[PDB]
Design a protein around this ligand. Structure first.
Ligand SMILES: CC(C)N1CCN(C(=O)c2cccs2)CC1
Length: 171
């Protein structure tokens, strides 16, 4: 059985219990913490690409009001985010299972941009998601996994100083 697990969930849960925020810039900002995934149960000899996208967790705009995050009243449909290909893709099952798959080079932006960067809506809440795509073989297959622990609101600057402090303490 293909098992997908979150590396350093202890640290993510510190961020989650304060409401995590991720900076987005015109040029794109790398994530901290970085999404690292533990993968077992692949065919060491089969070929796979690892894909990362961000699901809008709800249809609302959020705002930091009197030291607390609160959803707007006026939901709108949120089109799904573009997908980021892990730069080691495509690769053998063995490659992916020998160490945590680290999405350290993904950059989050608020502007439609050349390429690489993933555009998110500022003040929307996001749930990171990966797709493991078996490629090259005859039988294409996809396995998807969500990481609730890694939820965040996309912000152009930190609102909760407790988050600012955690980001620095653990970088
Ligand atoms: C030209 C460049 C953008 N390539 C597109 C395909 N790609 C993959 O690893 C994928 C395979 C199956 C689904 S995605 C990365 C390399």
């Amino acid at each position: 059985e293909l098992r997908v697990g979150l590396e350093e969930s202890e640290l993510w849960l510190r961020f989650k219990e304060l409401t995590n925020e991720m900076i987005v810039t015109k040029n794109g900002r790398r994530m901290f913490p970085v999404l690292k995934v533990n993968v077992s149960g692949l065919d060491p000899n089969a070929m796979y690409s690892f894909l990362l996208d961000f699901v809008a967790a709800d249809n609302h705009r959020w705002k930091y009001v009197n030291g607390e995050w609160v959803p707007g009243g006026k939901p709108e449909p949120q089109a799904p985010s573009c997908v980021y290909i892990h730069p080691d893709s495509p690769n053998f099952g063995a490659h992916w299972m020998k160490a945590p798959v680290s999405f350290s080079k993904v950059k989050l932006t608020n502007k439609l941009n050349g390429g690489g960067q993933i555009m998110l809506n500022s003040l929307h809440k996001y749930e990171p998601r990966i797709h493991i795509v078996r490629v090259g073989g005859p039988q294409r297959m996809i396995t998807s996994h969500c990481f609730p622990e890694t939820q965040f609101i996309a912000v152009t600057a930190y609102q909760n100083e407790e988050i600012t402090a955690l980001k620095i303490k653990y970088n």
